[PDB]
Design a protein around this ligand. Structure first.
Ligand SMILES: CC(=O)N[C@H]1[C@H](O[C@H]2[C@@H](O)[C@H](O)[C@@H](CO)O[C@H]2O)O[C@H](CO)[C@@H](O)[C@@H]1O
Ligand code: CA
Length: 139
């Protein structure tokens, strides 16, 4: 199955990283960010798919309840890659000021997309730590 990949600098504050692949929306992880409690544009969390599989969709749940429920990116992108070096943006997002809590980013790909790595990436500095809950693909 797909394995988790994320910005190496993050530190787990509460929960576990395996909670992001257990299929339960109500289990997640709270990551401490460095750089003065700031997630820089360009930081990321996603999946290494193993080989070049063709995807029909993704379902990513960001944020979580209680602790760090408001600790989410404002601006981010969904991007994919073949080599973990060059990336292609599928879609950008701006959810500045949206309510704290879980948020299910769910995308279906009209034309299937050929990828080895698929992730969410920050596009604007934010003075916050980060919560997430689940990451899944659809083929
Ligand atoms: C656990 C928590 O409160 N996390 C905060 C985080 O807090 C830092 C620090 O800024 C703060 O003064 C103390 C107070 O206990 O806790 C630390 O752990 O601050 C960041 C940035 O504001 C929040 O995103 C995060 O939720
Ligand atoms: Ca989960």
């Amino acid at each position: 199955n797909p394995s988790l990949i994320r910005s190496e600098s993050w530190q787990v504050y509460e929960g576990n990283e395996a909670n992001l692949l257990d299929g339960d929306d109500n289990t997640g992880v709270w990551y401490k960010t460095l750089n003065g409690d700031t997630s820089l544009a360009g930081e990321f969390i996603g999946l290494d798919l193993g080989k070049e599989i063709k995807l029909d969709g993704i379902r990513f749940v960001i944020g979580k309840n209680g602790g760090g429920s408001s600790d989410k990116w404002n601006k981010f992108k969904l991007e994919y890659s073949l080599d973990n070096e060059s990336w292609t943006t599928i879609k950008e997002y701006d959810k500045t000021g949206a309510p704290a809590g879980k948020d299910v980013i769910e995308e279906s790909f009209e034309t299937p997309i050929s990828a080895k790595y698929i992730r969410l990436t920050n596009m604007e500095n934010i003075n916050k730590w980060l919560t997430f809950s689940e990451f899944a693909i659809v083929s």
